[PDB]
Paper text:
Ferritin represents a class of natural protein nanocages, which is an iron storage protein that widely exists in nature. Ferritin consists of 24 subunits that self-assemble into a 432-point symmetrical cage-like structure with 12 of the two-fold, 8 of the 3-fold, and 6 of the 4-fold channels. The ferritin nanocage structure endows it with unique functions: the primary function of ferritin is to store iron while playing an important role in detoxification of iron and oxygen-related radical products in vivo. In this study, for the first time, we demonstrated that the ferritin from kuruma prawns (Marsupenaeus japonicus), named MjF, has a pronouncedly larger ability to resist denaturation induced by Cd2+ and Hg2+ as compared to its analogue, human H-chain ferritin (HuHF), despite the fact that these two proteins share a high similarity in protein structure.
To obtain direct evidence for the binding of Hg2+ and Cd2+ to MjF, we tried to crystallize MjF upon mixing with heavy metal ions (Hg2+ and Cd2+, respectively) by screening a wide range of solution conditions at 20 °C. Eventually, we were able to crystallize both complexes of MjF plus Hg2+ and MjF plus Cd2+ with good diffraction and solved their structure at a resolution of 2.3 Å (I4 space group) and 3.0 Å (P6322 space group), respectively. Similarly, the crystal structure of the complex of MjF and Cd2+ revealed that there are also 24 Cd2+ occurring at the protein shell, and that Cd2+ also coordinates with Cys13 but with relatively low occupancies. However, Cd2+ binds to Asp125 instead of Asn123 which is used for coordination with Hg2+. Thus, it seems that these two heavy metal ions exhibit higher selectivity for Cys residues in protein. In contrast, each MjF subunit only contains one Cys residue at position 13, which is located within the 3-fold channel. Consequently, it is hard for Hg2+ or Cd2+ to cross-link MjF molecules through its coordination with Cys13 residues due to seriously steric hindrance. Since there are 24 subunits per ferritin molecule, these findings suggest that each subunit may capture three Cd2+ in solution.
Author numbering:
A (entry chain B), B (entry chain D), C (entry chain D), D (entry chain B): 2 to 56, 58 to 99, 101 to 172
């Protein structure tokens, strides 16, 4: 064990590692989405910049978990990162319904982790998750939900999608 | 009691108290509409900003009458504020016609209050109403009218509404 | 309907709607007190400014819950806002003890709402309540307490109240 | 008659002259009050500055009436100015109850004049009075009423009056 380790149970150390992987996976789906919308036969630069910033952001989240793992005395164990579930991501609206569901799975994974931290009476870890991750996921979800409604209104394809893309840039 | 009351009749004092309630109700209707247009399944932020400013400006008008009541010597009587007729305000065009409707009611009330003021030979109260309320009300009716015409032209729903929303923002 | 709702239970949604009403009522009580202390026969402008800011900060809290309801997926239900228990709030000290009383009621409500949030394992709702409401409420109770003690020392009426008013300004 | 005179009835010309005198008289009472409070055995510099500014202000009002008399084609007829009703003005509170009543008489005289202007269908003159004089008198009255209440609270004499005077400076 570690010299700084205090009130840090093996269960929570294990879930932070699985969470790290999950965040890297989401970062990777989003990176895949960013350059999909930069294809000449797609050409949605607003959508691309948006999923690029999302990929950055998820990768940021993984690093903060890694830093926390070290801060409490746990040990970072890095696993394989899966291929993006798709190689081609469809229409703008389809890519957004995808990210909505993906941020929801992550939200679900984070809430299960907060439950683990309560159960093990780790107030430091519950505060971490309530302040850096659960706040972030709920805002992210609401933002994409707004976007899905806005994009459906403009017409999810054709001229409306062209205009919506501009406003996302 | 009061030491400033001069040429201030009781049915004008009563009218002002009843007007303060009407203004607070309208403030709460526009507040209601404000947040309706933030629901993730409505997502019309321009409509939301326009109605939040409207809630503000109506609450201001109520405050201004409260200040007036005291300036003249009358006594403020605040009644309960009715719940808005709706929880869901429908489409952007339906909410605009609701506001147009509502502004005209407030205008009619204000014009009755102006009449009562003349009837009792209160030139101060008429001046207050003419400079502070009837001027603003007729302006605000003309604007919501312009808005309704523009929105019907842009196509009341669809891409047009998405575009008309962005100008309101 | 909503596309963002995740881990958002109905009795928390209901509590938030009932809390929004409570906040709007308190906003209207402080509004009432605000203008009471402007009557030409009361003329306590420091007390008036303190209660007008209080009306503002309570209306803000209601708005913040409204924003939260939408962020989580719940649906805002606005009820009628009761008329304040009084039209004349008595002396400066009597109005302060009224506010102290009222703030504690809101605090008790908020603490019940926090309890309901834990009961349903909503760590987001507890975090919202802890950072946004319980923190501000306990601060505001401590301030009105300090105020009440100072005003009783300065002599609750008389010259002391005239002087204590000027500090509040 | 005059080359610019249009829709200006002899009645309204006559009342503007009596009003001019009245304003000069009030200016003169206030000048008398200003230097009363500068006596070594009184020494209330706040009260003095306040009635000095009032004397200025009333004298200003008389001039604006004179200018209006010329603007419409009437002719300024200047009468004797009475001695101030008192040579010694008593306590601070007594001087303020005096000015309150004096501004009320003037308000009464102005309202009678507005009535004359309505009766003669002179919209220019009713607008003049509603915008430069009735607005001014109601504010003045409310201000002095506030002051009478504030001063009674501080204790209308002794230490409280000393402190109130400072705040008026
Ligand atoms: Fe993440
Ligand atoms: Fe209004
Ligand atoms: Fe509150
Ligand atoms: Fe005057």
């Amino acid at each position: 064990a570690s010299q700084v380790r205090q009130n840090y149970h093996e269960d929570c150390e294990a879930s932070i590692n699985k969470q790290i992987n999950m965040e890297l996976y989401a970062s990777y789906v989003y990176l895949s989405m960013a350059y999909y919308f930069e294809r000449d036969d797609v050409a949605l630069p607003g959508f691309a910049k948006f999923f690029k910033e999302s990929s950055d952001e998820e990768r940021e989240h993984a690093q903060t978990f890694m830093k926390y793992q070290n801060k409490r005395g746990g040990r970072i164990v890095l696993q394989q990162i899966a291929a993006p579930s798709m190689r081609e991501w469809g229409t703008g609206l389809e890519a957004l319904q995808a990210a909505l569901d993906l941020e929801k799975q992550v939200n679900q994974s984070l809430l299960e982790l907060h439950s683990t931290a309560s159960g093990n009476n780790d107030p430091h870890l519950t505060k971490l998750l309530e302040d850096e991750y659960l706040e972030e996921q709920v805002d992210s979800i609401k933002k994409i939900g707004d976007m899905i409604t806005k994009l459906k209104r403009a017409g999810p394809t054709g001229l409306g999608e062209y205009m919506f893309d501009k406003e996302l840039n």
